[PDB]
Amino acid sequence: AQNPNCNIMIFHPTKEEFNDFDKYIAYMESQGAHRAGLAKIIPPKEWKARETYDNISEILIATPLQQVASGRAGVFTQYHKKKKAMTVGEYRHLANSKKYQTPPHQNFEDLERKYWKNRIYNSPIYGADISGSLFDENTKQWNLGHLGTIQDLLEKECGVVIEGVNTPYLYFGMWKTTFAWHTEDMDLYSINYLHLGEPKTWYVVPPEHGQRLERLARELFPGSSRGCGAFLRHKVALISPTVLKENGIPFNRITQEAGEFMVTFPYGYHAGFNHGFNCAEAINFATPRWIDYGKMASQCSCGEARVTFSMDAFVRILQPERYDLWKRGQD
Ligand SMILES: O=C(O)CNC(=O)C(=O)O
Ligand SMILES: [Mg+2]
Ligand code: NI
Ligand SMILES: [Zn+2]
């Protein structure tokens, strides 16, 4: 079995290997990459996402979100307070302000220490889930707006034709902006490209150990767990690496820098934080190996998780028994 310790693998495809996206995912899996839940892909030196980022300031962040924490430094939840619209240029100036800017630090490890010590005492503002793309239309390789769609994958594997669409989303971050512990909708893959700016630190639990994380989360968030049998689908709970180690949860960590891709694999729980002003693009995708995870994915039916239109079909076809309860939670 490849990668039996479930380490995060880093790949350096050549320009020729960068042509066929599906093939390369399957290659990474042949080497055991999925066992970690997360892999990094460094593009070939010849590749670029677009020519420059000099002209992005007029993108609108319609609903910036202030991430307000509750709990203790290593075990907390966050809620998202809506703020007034602002442009990417306005958001960048805010991120760089004395109130929000990255503190002085020695290296990524020092910054990570500072994040986990101090995160809860601040409320950073995040631009999330902004439909759109920063890839040039002429970028042919690893262009996250030109991937094969999940609806087409389901039709190819299973024969069923379904409604829905699959487009990318932009994220604008600042110091301490935080992504809570989660798997993807329907335990899909994700891919994330860091277009510009400061790094993103990731934490990940191997898919084969995801239920260990779920059991700790039910212990640490006991009211949330009583409220919903899949409350991590609410994407609000944080647990620090120190707490994970104290509780024997297997995990790994890595820092993504600008110009790098990260792939998350089905049922790979992940969480993390941004180091400073940045812009990322991400989208969910599927492969044939996803189908069995889609069929088994947990679902939130309490009403909290509310998700895209296109997830309807996935539940309807892959999880017909669950469909009525889950759709009630959507309505
Ligand atoms: O940019 C982000 O925070 C969101 N990314 C992830 O949780 C991911 O790509 O799966
Ligand atoms: Mg612009
Ligand atoms: Ni994710
Ligand atoms: Zn729920």
Side-chain angles (χ1 to χ4, degrees), residues 1-47 49-50 52-81 83-214 216-244 246-305 307-327 329-330:
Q2 296 268 225
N3 190 24
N5 283 357
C6 303
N7 296 313
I8 299 167
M9 300 178 70
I10 304 160
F11 292 89
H12 288 86
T14 64
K15 65 189 192 306
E16 296 77 18
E17 288 169 342
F18 221 49
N19 284 322
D20 184 337
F21 183 84
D22 288 346
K23 178 180 194 173
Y24 200 80
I25 301 302
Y27 170 70
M28 294 161 56
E29 296 182 359
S30 75
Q31 306 302 295
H34 57 294
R35 298 194 63 183
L38 182 66
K40 176 179 293 196
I41 310 92
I42 294 172
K45 72 190 180 293
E46 299 87 0
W47 183 92
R50 67 174 306 108
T52 79
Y53 291 87
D54 293 338
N55 304 114
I56 67 168
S57 306
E58 319 307 312
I59 293 172
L60 192 67
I61 307 170
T63 314
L65 303 178
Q66 179 167 55
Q67 302 186 294
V68 180
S70 297
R72 63 181 175 101
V75 180
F76 63 89
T77 60
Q78 60 187 7
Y79 84 93
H80 295 169
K81 182 173 180 171
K83 307 293 281 184
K84 293 196 156 147
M86 78 186 71
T87 67
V88 164
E90 290 165 338
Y91 177 84
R92 181 176 59 233
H93 191 256
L94 186 69
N96 293 338
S97 71
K98 290 189 188 173
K99 180 172 182 65
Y100 291 111
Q101 71 184 213
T102 316
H105 62 281
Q106 294 296 339
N107 50 40
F108 293 170
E109 184 168 354
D110 187 31
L111 195 69
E112 181 184 39
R113 182 193 63 74
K114 291 171 185 293
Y115 174 85
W116 292 103
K117 183 180 169 54
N118 300 318
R119 159 70 186 96
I120 64 169
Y121 303 112
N122 299 85
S123 301
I125 293 169
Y126 200 11
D129 299 314
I130 296 157
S131 291
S133 185
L134 289 168
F135 288 85
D136 187 313
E137 73 183 358
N138 297 318
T139 299
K140 298 319 181 185
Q141 301 171 314
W142 287 56
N143 182 325
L144 300 187
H146 295 170
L147 305 178
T149 69
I150 299 160
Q151 292 78 19
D152 286 335
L153 181 284
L154 181 156
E155 174 186 335
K156 292 181 288 188
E157 293 302 295
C158 299
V160 66
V161 183
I162 54 171
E163 76 290 349
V165 298
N166 180 201
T167 54
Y169 296 92
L170 299 179
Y171 301 80
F172 294 93
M174 66 169 64
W175 170 235
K176 283 172 174 169
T177 50
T178 301
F179 53 108
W181 281 104
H182 71 287
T183 63
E184 309 299 306
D185 289 343
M186 219 67 188
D187 297 343
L188 281 157
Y189 295 73
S190 67
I191 181 162
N192 180 301
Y193 183 67
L194 191 50
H195 279 279
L196 61 99
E198 301 319 303
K200 185 182 316 274
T201 294
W202 301 68
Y203 304 91
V204 59
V205 174
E208 68 204 63
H209 301 303
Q211 296 85 358
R212 296 181 185 224
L213 182 70
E214 293 172 351
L216 177 62
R218 287 193 305 271
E219 293 161 3
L220 294 179
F221 305 97
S224 294
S225 179
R226 288 189 285 276
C228 181
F231 76 95
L232 293 176
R233 294 285 166 207
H234 305 169
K235 307 198 294 189
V236 304
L238 279 301
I239 305 165
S240 72
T242 294
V243 174
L244 292 178
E246 281 168 347
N247 292 275
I249 308 304
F251 76 94
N252 281 300
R253 77 192 80 190
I254 194 169
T255 300
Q256 176 194 20
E257 298 185 78
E260 303 178 339
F261 290 92
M262 304 298 296
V263 165
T264 81
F265 296 85
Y267 196 60
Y269 275 102
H270 55 283
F273 65 89
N274 293 306
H275 293 206
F277 173 70
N278 65 18
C279 168
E281 182 170 339
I283 197 177
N284 295 120
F285 72 90
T287 71
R289 198 175 66 79
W290 167 68
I291 296 281
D292 281 349
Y293 290 89
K295 294 171 174 166
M296 293 186 301
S298 64
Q299 305 293 358
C300 168
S301 309
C302 77
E304 283 301 311
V307 304
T308 185
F309 188 115
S310 307
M311 227 190 94
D312 192 281
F314 305 155
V315 183
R316 198 171 68 246
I317 297 311
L318 297 184
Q319 307 183 306
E321 188 272 326
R322 292 180 168 176
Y323 181 66
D324 280 350
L325 182 64
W326 170 82
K327 195 162 43 61
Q330 237 48 1

